[PDB]
Design a binder for this molecule. Sequence first.
Ligand SMILES: Nc1ccn([C@@H]2O[C@H](COP(=O)(O)OP(=O)(O)OP(=O)(O)O)[C@@H](O)[C@H]2O)c(=O)n1
Ligand SMILES: Nc1ccn([C@@H]2O[C@H](COP(=O)(O)OP(=O)(O)OP(=O)(O)O)[C@@H](O)[C@H]2O)c(=O)n1
Ligand SMILES: [Ca+2]
Ligand SMILES: [Ca+2]
Ligand SMILES: [Ca+2]
Lengths: 225, 225
Amino acid sequence: MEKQNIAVILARQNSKGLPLKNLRKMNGISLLGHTINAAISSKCFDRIIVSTDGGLIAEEAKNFGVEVVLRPAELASDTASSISGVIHALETIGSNSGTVTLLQPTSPLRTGAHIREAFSLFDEKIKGSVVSACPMEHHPLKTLLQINNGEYAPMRHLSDLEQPRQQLPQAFRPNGAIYINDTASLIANNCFFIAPTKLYIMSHQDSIDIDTELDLQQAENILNH
Amino acid sequence: MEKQNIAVILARQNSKGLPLKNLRKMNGISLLGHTINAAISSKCFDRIIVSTDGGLIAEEAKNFGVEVVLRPAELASDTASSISGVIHALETIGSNSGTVTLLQPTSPLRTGAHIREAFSLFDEKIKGSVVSACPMEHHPLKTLLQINNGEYAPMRHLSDLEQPRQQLPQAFRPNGAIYINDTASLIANNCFFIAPTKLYIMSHQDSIDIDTELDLQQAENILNH
Ligand SMILES: Nc1ccn([C@@H]2O[C@H](COP(=O)(O)OP(=O)(O)OP(=O)(O)O)[C@@H](O)[C@H]2O)c(=O)n1
Ligand SMILES: Nc1ccn([C@@H]2O[C@H](COP(=O)(O)OP(=O)(O)OP(=O)(O)O)[C@@H](O)[C@H]2O)c(=O)n1
Ligand SMILES: [Ca+2]
Ligand SMILES: [Ca+2]
Ligand SMILES: [Ca+2]
C-alpha cells in the first residue's frame, strides 16, 4: 500500500456544551463545513474523512464531496477518546501509512492556509507531531496542583510563583485545531503527541474554539472584522 | 515581643493602568474601603496597616479607623515590589513576630469571610504560607514550554496533553487577594511563598482583579446581581 495523506474530521452529533454544534452555522456555513473547506483549500490531503455517528452530519459531509465513516454509538459517546475515533477511521478506510491529521470542527477560524503552514513544519524523516498551539494568558509555572488531604504542590518550583514572568520560559497550549502525525507512528503509539513535537503557533483570535453560544457569536464577529 | 496578627494593605497613589484606582468607588465605597472592611470584618487581625505615599489614601484609611504608614517615594514607584512594601510596614510599626497578611485593594470581592476561612488553614507550628487562588480555565499540565527557540517540551508528560481533564490533578493559580505568612519567616525569606504553601480556593467571580475601568464596572455589576 502507497502512502496517503488523510484528514480525519471527528464530528459526532451530541454536544452537551452547545447542542448539535457541529452543524451550527457561522456566516451561513456549518462548523463542519468551515473545517471541510479548510481541509480542501489546504491541498494537503489525498482524502478527507468525516467520522460521525451518522444522520444530518453524514449528509452534510456528503454534500461537501468528502468521505463518511460511520462510528458505532460506543465510539461517539461522551467518554469516547478522539484517538479511538481516528484509529477507527483509519481502519475503516484501510490506511496505515502516510500522514493523519485531526481537524476539529470546533476551530472554525483555522483555515487551509493555517493547515498548509503547519504541514511545512512536518518532518517526513523525523516524524514527530505538528500540533497547533497558542500562547497562554496565565503562565502555567505560576500554578499549584491539588494533591491528597488538602495539600498542594507547585507546578515546578515555589520560586516560579514569584518570578518575573518574562524570566520564565514561554508557554503554549495546544488549541485543538490541528494535529499532524505520521500514520504508522500514530497507530503504534495510540496517541496524537509523538516526540519530537513541533508547534504551529496561532494567535488567540484564530484559536477560538466553540463550546458555547457566546463563542459562536464571538467567532462570527472575528470573521467579519 | 508578643506575637501580633498584622494585615498590611499596600495602596500606592500613582497607579498607571487605572488612574487613582485605590480610591475609585464601587457601589459607593472606595476599593481601599472594601478591603479595609474585609480586614475588619474578618476579625483575624490585631492591627490593620495601610501603607501609602498618597495624602488622600492616608485620609481615607484614617477615616476607617486603621493605622497609616507613610511610604517613601522609592517604595511607591511603578517597579517597587510588594515585598519591600510589607517589610517596610513591619519595620515602621516594629513588628517582627506573629503573622502578616497582604490584602491587595485590587481584590474587592474578597470578603472578611474569605479572609477568615483562609486564616483557618494557617498552621502556627508548620508556618507555610496560605495564598488565595482560583481555578484555571486551561489546565497547566496541558502546556509546553519553549526550550531553545524552535523546541518545546511538555510541562510534565506528553500523555498529559491528551489526558481527559477530570483525570488530572486539579490546578489553581494565586489570585492576588490574600497572602498569609509567619512574620519572622517572611522577613527571613523576603518573599510571599514559603513551603509548604497551602491554597485557599476562591471562585473566578470572587477573584476578580481591578486593572481597568471595565474591571471596576464588572465588579460593581456582580455586587448588584
Ligand atoms: N470522540 C469524539 C471526541 C470529540 N469529537 C468532536 O471533536 C470536536 C471537539 O470536541 P469537544 O468540543 O472537546 O467536546 P464535545 O464532546 O464536542 O462536546 P460535549 O462535550 O458537549 O458533548 C467536536 O467537534 C466534537 O464533536 C468527536 O466527534 N468525537
Ligand atoms: N509595591 C506595591 C505594589 C502594589 N501596590 C498596590 O497593590 C495592588 C495591586 O497592584 P497593581 O494592581 O499592580 O496596581 P498599581 O501598581 O497601583 O497599578 P498599575 O500597575 O496600573 O500602575 C494595588 O492596590 C496597588 O496600588 C502597592 O501599593 N505597592
Ligand atoms: Ca474556549
Ligand atoms: Ca503595578
Ligand atoms: Ca494589577
